[PDB]
């Protein structure tokens, strides 16, 4: 529940932790998130969209 598996767009997969600010609401699977190069922390998520939806 604290640390899960992430899938990067480039192809290699990683595992990250949980930031003390965010909660487990958006941490549920199936939601695209964002990561950091240092410590692989999570600042916020990334809501999906489409091309014609814009």
């Amino acid at each position: 529940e604290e640390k899960f598996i992430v899938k990067a767009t480039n192809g290699p997969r990683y595992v990250v932790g949980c930031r003390r600010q965010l909660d487990k609401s958006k941490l549920k699977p199936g939601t695209r998130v964002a990561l950091d190069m240092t410590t692989l922390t999570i600042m916020r998520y990334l809501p999906r969209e489409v091309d014609p939806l814009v």
Partner: protein, 53 residues
């Protein structure tokens, strides 16, 4: 030689007796170093990593 073995042997009594607190120090300190190096090699294993096959 017959009676000198007592007082001559007392030096071996002291030389072997002095090793007690010494081996106490080694057995009490080298395990502290064992948990020092143990936690040092344990903390190397970090959660952020790449998954292969």
């Amino acid at each position: 030689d017959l009676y000198s073995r007592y007082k001559k042997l007392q030096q071996e009594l002291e030389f072997l007796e002095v090793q007690e607190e010494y081996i106490k120090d080694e057995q009490k300190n080298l395990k502290k170093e064992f948990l020092h190096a143990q936690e040092e090699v344990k903390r190397i294993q970090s959660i952020p990593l790449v998954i292969g096959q």
